[PDB]
Motif scaffolding. Sequence first.
Motif, PDB file in Angstrom:
ATOM      1  N   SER A  52      87.653  28.146  44.294  1.00 43.28           N
ATOM      2  CA  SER A  52      88.976  27.558  44.355  1.00 43.28           C
ATOM      3  C   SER A  52      89.368  27.256  45.796  1.00 43.28           C
ATOM      4  O   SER A  52      89.042  28.013  46.714  1.00 43.28           O
ATOM      5  N   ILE A  53      90.068  26.157  45.982  1.00 46.94           N
ATOM      6  CA  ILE A  53      90.517  25.728  47.288  1.00 46.94           C
ATOM      7  C   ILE A  53      91.990  25.372  47.215  1.00 46.94           C
ATOM      8  O   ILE A  53      92.398  24.548  46.400  1.00 46.94           O
ATOM      9  N   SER A  54      92.788  26.005  48.033  1.00 47.10           N
ATOM     10  CA  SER A  54      94.211  25.748  48.044  1.00 47.10           C
ATOM     11  C   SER A  54      94.711  25.745  49.468  1.00 47.10           C
ATOM     12  O   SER A  54      94.223  26.495  50.281  1.00 47.10           O
ATOM     13  N   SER A  55      95.681  24.909  49.765  1.00 50.19           N
ATOM     14  CA  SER A  55      96.223  24.846  51.110  1.00 50.19           C
ATOM     15  C   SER A  55      97.234  25.960  51.302  1.00 50.19           C
ATOM     16  O   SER A  55      97.457  26.441  52.415  1.00 50.19           O
ATOM     17  N   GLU A  56      97.822  26.366  50.198  1.00 54.41           N
ATOM     18  CA  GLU A  56      98.789  27.435  50.172  1.00 54.41           C
ATOM     19  C   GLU A  56      98.768  28.099  48.795  1.00 54.41           C
ATOM     20  O   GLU A  56      98.712  29.320  48.681  1.00 54.41           O
ATOM     21  N   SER A  57      98.785  27.271  47.758  1.00 55.95           N
ATOM     22  CA  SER A  57      98.718  27.720  46.378  1.00 55.95           C
ATOM     23  C   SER A  57      98.160  26.593  45.518  1.00 55.95           C
ATOM     24  O   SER A  57      98.307  25.423  45.866  1.00 55.95           O
ATOM     25  N   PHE A  58      97.515  26.931  44.419  1.00 52.33           N
ATOM     26  CA  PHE A  58      96.936  25.917  43.556  1.00 52.33           C
ATOM     27  C   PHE A  58      97.823  25.660  42.353  1.00 52.33           C
ATOM     28  O   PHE A  58      98.210  26.590  41.642  1.00 52.33           O
ATOM     29  N   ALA A  59      98.148  24.403  42.140  1.00 52.20           N
ATOM     30  CA  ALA A  59      98.968  23.992  41.020  1.00 52.20           C
ATOM     31  C   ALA A  59      98.729  22.524  40.721  1.00 52.20           C
ATOM     32  O   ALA A  59      98.945  21.663  41.576  1.00 52.20           O
ATOM     33  N   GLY A  60      98.253  22.242  39.532  1.00 51.96           N
ATOM     34  CA  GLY A  60      97.989  20.877  39.147  1.00 51.96           C
ATOM     35  C   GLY A  60      98.032  20.703  37.654  1.00 51.96           C
ATOM     36  O   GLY A  60      97.026  20.352  37.033  1.00 51.96           O
ATOM     37  N   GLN A  61      99.190  20.955  37.073  1.00 48.22           N
ATOM     38  CA  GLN A  61      99.362  20.846  35.636  1.00 48.22           C
ATOM     39  C   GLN A  61      99.488  19.388  35.214  1.00 48.22           C
ATOM     40  O   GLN A  61     100.595  18.856  35.059  1.00 48.22           O
ATOM     41  N   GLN A  62      98.349  18.747  35.060  1.00 52.60           N
ATOM     42  CA  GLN A  62      98.282  17.361  34.663  1.00 52.60           C
ATOM     43  C   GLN A  62      96.902  17.059  34.117  1.00 52.60           C
ATOM     44  O   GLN A  62      95.898  17.236  34.812  1.00 52.60           O
ATOM     45  N   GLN A  63      96.846  16.620  32.880  1.00 51.10           N
ATOM     46  CA  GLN A  63      95.589  16.291  32.252  1.00 51.10           C
ATOM     47  C   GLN A  63      95.779  15.182  31.239  1.00 51.10           C
ATOM     48  O   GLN A  63      96.379  15.385  30.178  1.00 51.10           O
ATOM     49  N   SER A  64      95.304  14.011  31.589  1.00 46.95           N
ATOM     50  CA  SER A  64      95.374  12.849  30.731  1.00 46.95           C
ATOM     51  C   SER A  64      94.255  11.887  31.098  1.00 46.95           C
ATOM     52  O   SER A  64      94.149  11.462  32.252  1.00 46.95           O
ATOM     53  N   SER A  65      93.424  11.546  30.129  1.00 45.62           N
ATOM     54  CA  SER A  65      92.277  10.673  30.361  1.00 45.62           C
ATOM     55  C   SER A  65      91.757  10.115  29.040  1.00 45.62           C
ATOM     56  O   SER A  65      90.554   9.890  28.877  1.00 45.62           O
ATOM     57  N   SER A  66      92.670   9.880  28.101  1.00 47.58           N
ATOM     58  CA  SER A  66      92.313   9.326  26.808  1.00 47.58           C
ATOM     59  C   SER A  66      91.833   7.890  26.961  1.00 47.58           C
ATOM     60  O   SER A  66      92.636   6.960  27.076  1.00 47.58           O
ATOM     61  N   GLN A  67      90.529   7.726  27.002  1.00 44.11           N
ATOM     62  CA  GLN A  67      89.914   6.431  27.168  1.00 44.11           C
ATOM     63  C   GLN A  67      88.450   6.538  26.750  1.00 44.11           C
ATOM     64  O   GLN A  67      88.012   7.612  26.322  1.00 44.11           O
ATOM     65  N   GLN A  68      87.712   5.438  26.855  1.00 39.26           N
ATOM     66  CA  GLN A  68      86.285   5.406  26.529  1.00 39.26           C
ATOM     67  C   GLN A  68      86.048   5.508  25.032  1.00 39.26           C
ATOM     68  O   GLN A  68      85.678   6.562  24.512  1.00 39.26           O
ATOM     69  N   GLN A  69      86.298   4.413  24.350  1.00 39.34           N
ATOM     70  CA  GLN A  69      86.077   4.317  22.927  1.00 39.34           C
ATOM     71  C   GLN A  69      85.091   3.198  22.658  1.00 39.34           C
ATOM     72  O   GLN A  69      85.447   2.018  22.718  1.00 39.34           O
ATOM     73  N   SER A  70      83.861   3.561  22.384  1.00 34.96           N
ATOM     74  CA  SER A  70      82.811   2.594  22.166  1.00 34.96           C
ATOM     75  C   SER A  70      81.555   3.275  21.646  1.00 34.96           C
ATOM     76  O   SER A  70      81.525   4.499  21.478  1.00 34.96           O
ATOM     77  N   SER A  71      80.528   2.490  21.405  1.00 35.36           N
ATOM     78  CA  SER A  71      79.275   2.991  20.889  1.00 35.36           C
ATOM     79  C   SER A  71      78.165   1.985  21.161  1.00 35.36           C
ATOM     80  O   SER A  71      78.381   0.998  21.867  1.00 35.36           O
ATOM     81  N   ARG A  72      76.982   2.243  20.642  1.00 34.05           N
ATOM     82  CA  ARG A  72      75.878   1.318  20.805  1.00 34.05           C
ATOM     83  C   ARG A  72      75.872   0.307  19.675  1.00 34.05           C
ATOM     84  O   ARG A  72      75.276   0.602  18.615  1.00 34.05           O
TER      85      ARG A  72
END
Length: 169
Positions: free
Chosen positions: A149-169
Amino acid sequence: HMASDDRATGPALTPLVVAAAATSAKVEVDSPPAPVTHGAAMPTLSSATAQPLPVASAPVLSAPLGSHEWQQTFSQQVMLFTRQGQQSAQLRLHPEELGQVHISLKLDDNQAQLQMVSPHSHVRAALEAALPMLRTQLAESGIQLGQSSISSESFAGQQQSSSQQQSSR
């Protein structure tokens, strides 16, 4: 006695005012294609042979960002720490303004959690890249670098969104 008002004021006409009928749908549409061309050649240069340059152990960890020597030295200091039995340490690092980052490697079972307190800079890029290499060095000593873990003072990053990539062969 008596009274007589008598009225006569009373409007009586049909109001009518309406006129609107037209349209608009022309001009301003489509766009010109941007021209593109590739090529290059890349000037090649044969590696000149010469004798290795004399060196020594670098004082603290202060080398150009990207150099493998800086990464190797980063691992070296940790190897020494684990040999002594310590785990928390300070170190002079760049940007010089940092003065001293706080390295705190935790130890549990056989997995080490490496926590470091430092701001976000290009230093993290090469430093973080050295972590997968460090786990290899420590692994030779028996211990496994698992968490980091790497923090400048404290670690906080409550964000998660990446709904993408819908495909196939």
